[PDB]
Each structure stands twice: as C-alpha cells, then as structure tokens.
Amino acid sequence: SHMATLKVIGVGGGGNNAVNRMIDHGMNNVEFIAINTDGQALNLSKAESKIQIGEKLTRGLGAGANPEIGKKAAEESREQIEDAIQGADMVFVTSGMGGGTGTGAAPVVAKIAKEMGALTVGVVTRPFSFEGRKRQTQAAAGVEAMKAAVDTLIVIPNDRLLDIVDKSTPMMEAFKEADNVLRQGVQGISDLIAVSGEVNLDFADVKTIMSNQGSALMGIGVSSGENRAVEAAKKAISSPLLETSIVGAQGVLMNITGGESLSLFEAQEAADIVQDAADEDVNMIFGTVINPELQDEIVVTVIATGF
Ligand SMILES: Nc1nc2c(ncn2[C@@H]2O[C@H](COP(=O)(O)OP(=O)(O)O)[C@@H](O)[C@H]2O)c(=O)[nH]1
Numbered sequence: 001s002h003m004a005t006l007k008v009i010g011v012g013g014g015g016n017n018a019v020n021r022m023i024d025h026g027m028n029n030v031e032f033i034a035i036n037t038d039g040q041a042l043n044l045s046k047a048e049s050k051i052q053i054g055e056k057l058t059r060g061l062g063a064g065a066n067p068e069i070g071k072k073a074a075e076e077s078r079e080q081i082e083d084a085i086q087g088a089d090m091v092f093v094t095s096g097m098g099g100g101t102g103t104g105a106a107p108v109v110a111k112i113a114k115e116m117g118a119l120t121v122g123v124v125t126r127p128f129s130f131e132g133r134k135r136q137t138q139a140a141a142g143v144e145a146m147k148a149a150v151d152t153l154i155v156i157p158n159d160r161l162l163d164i165v166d167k168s169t170p171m172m173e174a175f176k177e178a179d180n181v182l183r184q185g186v187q188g189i190s191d192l193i194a195v196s197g198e199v200n201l202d203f204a205d206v207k208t209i210m211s212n213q214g215s216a217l218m219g220i221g222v223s224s225g226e227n228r229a230v231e232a233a234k235k236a237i238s239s240p241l242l243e244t245s246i247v248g249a250q251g252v253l254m255n256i257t258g259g260e261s262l263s264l265f266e267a268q269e270a271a272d273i274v275q276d277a278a279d280e281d282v283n284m285i286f287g288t289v290i291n292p293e294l295q296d297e298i299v300v301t302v303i304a305t306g307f
C-alpha cells in the first residue's frame with residue numbers, strides 16, 4: 001500500500017561528488033538532487049534535479065570557504081529547495097564539512113526537509129588533519145548545526161581513510177570507500193521497504209528507530225559458509241570509517257536476509273553479536289527475509305541509534 005519516496009541530496013562539492021559517483025554506480029527508486037553555489041560543478045552533475053543556490057551572492061562561484069555564504073545562499077533559495085524536496089518521505093543529505101557551501105548550506109537543507117515532515121538523515125565528512133585547524137573548526141560547527149537539523153547523523157572523519165589505504169591507493173578509490181557508507185545505507189532501506197519479509201519490517205520501523213535520535217550507524221554485511229551469520233553481523237557493525245561506532249547503541253533495527261537454509265540459531269547468533277558489541281540493553285527491531293535465489297549467502301543490515 002505505502003511506498004516510501006527516498007531522495008538523496010548532495011550539498012556542495014563533496015556532496016555532489018558523492019551523488020555523481022552513486023549515480024554512476026547505479027541506484028534505482030531514489031531521486032537525486034544536486035545543490036551547489038558553484039555553477040561549474042553543477043553543470044557536470046549527473047543528477048536529474050539541480051539547484052544553483054546563491055547566484056546573486058556568489059555570482060555563480062563557490063562560497064570561497066565561507067560557511068556564512070553557504071548558509072545565506074541556501075536561505076535565499078529556500079523555495080527552490082522546498083520544491084525539490086516536496087513529496088519526500090525520507091531525505092539523505094550528504095556533504096563534506098569544512099568548506100563554505102556544505103558547511104553552511106547543508107544544515108539549512110536538512111532543516112527544510114525535516115520541517116516538511118521528512119525523515120532526515122545526514123551523512124557528512126570531516127576534513128583531513130592536513131587541511132588545517134581552521135578547516136576542522138569550521139567543520140565542527142557545521143557538524144553541530146547538522147546534528148540540530150537532522151533526525152539522525154552519520155559522520156565520516158576523512159582521516160579514517162588514511163587507515164584503509166596503502167601508500168599507492170588512488171584518492172578516488174579511497175573516496176569511493178567513504179561513498180559506500182551512504183550508498184549501502186540507502187540501498188538497505190530501499191530493500192527493506194520493497195520486499196515483504198517473513199518477519200516484516202517497513203518504513204514505520206525505520207522512522208521509529210531513526211526519528212529525532214542524533215548519532216547513528218548504518219551498516220550492511222554479507223558472508224557465506226560456516227559462521228556466516230556471525231561474520232555478516234560483525235561486518236555490518238564494524239566500519240573503520242565511522243565516528244560513531246556500535247558501542248553504546250540502545251536501539252537497533254536488524255534485518256537478516258537469507259535463503260531457505262536460514263536457521264533460527266544463526267539469527268540468534270547474529271542478534272547476539274550486535275547486542276554484545278553495543279554493550280547495552282538494546283531495544284531491537286528484528287526482521288527476516290527469505291530470498292530463495294540466495295543459496296549460501298546471508299546479508300545482515302543494521303541501523304543503530306540511541307547513543
Ligand atoms: N570524502 C570526500 N571528502 C571530500 C570530497 N570533496 C571534498 N571533500 C572534503 O569536503 C570538504 C569541503 O569541500 P567541498 O565539499 O568541496 O566544499 P564546498 O563546496 O564549499 O562545501 C573538504 O575540506 C574535504 O575534507 C569527496 O569527494 N569525498
């Protein structure tokens with residue numbers, strides 16, 4: 001009966017990069033919106049919906065690292081941003097904090113989306129330490145503004161990308177690894193909404209776990225063979241890229257997809273991995289999907305909140 005309208009919105013350079021790479025990767029049933037002050041970057045966006053903000057302010061340039069320009073640009077294009085969001089049931093706002101457009105404009109976009117009734121998730125990066133202390137301080141203020149404007153917020157410190165590269169990894173490949181946090185969180189929700197589960201979870205459970213919560217973790221894990229349930233759950237909660245780990249979570253939506261071999265015992269093992277790692281008494285919302293096209297693969301999806 002109900003089919004949730006999901007929109008992913010990139011705000012600023014880094015956010016629009018993410019959107020372009022997610023669109024290249026292929027993702028259906030999601031509307032993408034690109035928002036920027038910088039008209040040069042926007043002309044190259046792959047998104048179906050493009051909103052140039054603050055053209056009277058910047059004359060079509062970026063914000064020159066000034067968050068106040070990004071914020072005033074978003075406020076002045078409020079109506080345009082509302083028109084783009086209208087109809088959304090859920091909005092993901094992604095941006096790199098520390099510059100001028102994303103720092104300043106991404107919390108305004110998030111606010112508008114929450115004010116229109118949408119479940120609003122932010123997925124933002126913090127700058128590398130090598131970008132300097134001022135960039136980090138501006139980013140921190142952006143992160144705080146984002147937290148005040150979203151239902152849930154996922155922060156990716158870009159320094160963590162230095163933990164997963166070797167000395168030759170291309171920068172673009174490291175950036176794709178961070179893109180995965182948003183992409184797989186969105187796909188997980190889209191999949192949860194679209195399939196009926198044998199123990200069914202739907203968009204109302206997502207709203208319950210995510211609405212007005214603060215920090216979150218969104219993770220997916222796939223494994224096969226022996227101990228697949230424990231291994232997939234461990235993968236779902238363990239990302240080296242997250243500021244907010246699973247430790248401390250007090251609400252968890254956990255969906256397990258498997259073939260007809262999916263055992264009750266391994267569903268409990270998987271739930272216990274999450275609960276034990278949270279180190280809290282977790283209020284779990286537990287789902288199960290039987291996909292017979294799967295043989296030996298099991299997929300664990302986790303959304304964690306209540307920190
Ligand atoms: N992970 C990642 N970080 C980015 C990317 N682009 C920019 N950043 C980071 O985002 C911050 C803000 O840059 P940018 O989004 O281009 O600035 P803005 O357009 O003024 O908001 C930078 O300081 C970098 O830390 C990207 O594609 N991926």
Ligand SMILES: [K+]
Pocket residue numbers: 192193194195196197200201202
């Ligand atoms: K469902």
